[PDB]
Enzyme design. Sequence first.
Site, short mmCIF file in Angstrom:
data_model
loop_
_atom_site.label_atom_id
_atom_site.label_comp_id
_atom_site.label_asym_id
_atom_site.label_seq_id
_atom_site.Cartn_x
_atom_site.Cartn_y
_atom_site.Cartn_z
N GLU A 121 -6.20 -4.89 -6.29
CA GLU A 121 -5.70 -4.46 -7.56
C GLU A 121 -4.36 -4.61 -7.75
O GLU A 121 -3.87 -5.15 -8.83
CB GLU A 121 -6.12 -2.94 -7.26
CG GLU A 121 -6.45 -2.39 -8.87
CD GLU A 121 -5.31 -2.31 -9.89
OE1 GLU A 121 -4.38 -1.62 -9.16
OE2 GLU A 121 -5.37 -2.73 -10.77
N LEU A 140 1.18 6.54 -2.31
CA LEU A 140 0.10 5.70 -2.64
C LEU A 140 -1.28 6.04 -1.93
O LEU A 140 -2.19 5.38 -1.15
CB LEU A 140 0.55 4.40 -1.57
CG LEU A 140 -0.46 3.23 -2.32
CD1 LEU A 140 -0.35 2.56 -3.42
CD2 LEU A 140 -0.23 1.99 -1.04
#
Length: 202
Positions: A28, A21
Amino acid sequence: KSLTLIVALTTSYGIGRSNSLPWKLKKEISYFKRVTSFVPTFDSFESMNVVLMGRKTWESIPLQFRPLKGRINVVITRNESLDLGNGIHSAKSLDHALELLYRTYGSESSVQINRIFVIGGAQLYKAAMDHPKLDRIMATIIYKDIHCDVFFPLKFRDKEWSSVWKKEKHSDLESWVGTKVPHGKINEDGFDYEFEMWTRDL
Ligand SMILES: Nc1nc(=O)c2nc(CNc3ccc(C(=O)N[C@@H](CCC(=O)O)C(=O)O)cc3)cnc2[nH]1
């Protein structure tokens, strides 16, 4: 039906970086969540969207959010020696997945498919981009130079592709997703990003 692809990529088409990540974005991901989950509501049958993903993507989703809630999950694995659960579908390729879907959520199913989304990774994005049924791309453009080792397979926002892939007006994007969306660059934790919708004629 048509296939839609959803992706968050950098300006240089970078999809993923060195770590896990590489880009952390609560507003988002929430957009990813709402677009992939939005369905109409009918009284006589149940509507659900399908998310198609590769095995690495499946393995990247935190346990508390997996399978993706309220969506039909299909994981594409060829050497399927994966211990998937009950209710999770697996297919060898994208065409095999579509096959299983139309055979399973047919005329007699009380569950009817709304939209179908390809969520990655790059090997699945590659296959989709080559599919006669792909006609829309839901893209989040990250205006930052993140070190990526994995790229999106076709430079669809480039000049070289302008007569094939067209960037829709913001208002059409809002109409397709069923909600107004912030215009321009959004800053979230030092990251600038913008939402776009591109379509291709079939
Ligand atoms: N626009 C966009 N952003 C993304 O992060 C994204 N991610 C993937 C693949 N990776 C992932 C990883 C995690 C979750 C995920 O957790 N989804 C949850 C919401 C998590 C949350 O609210 O914190 C879901 O329920 O959708 C989704 C996709 C594919 N397309 C994308 N597209």
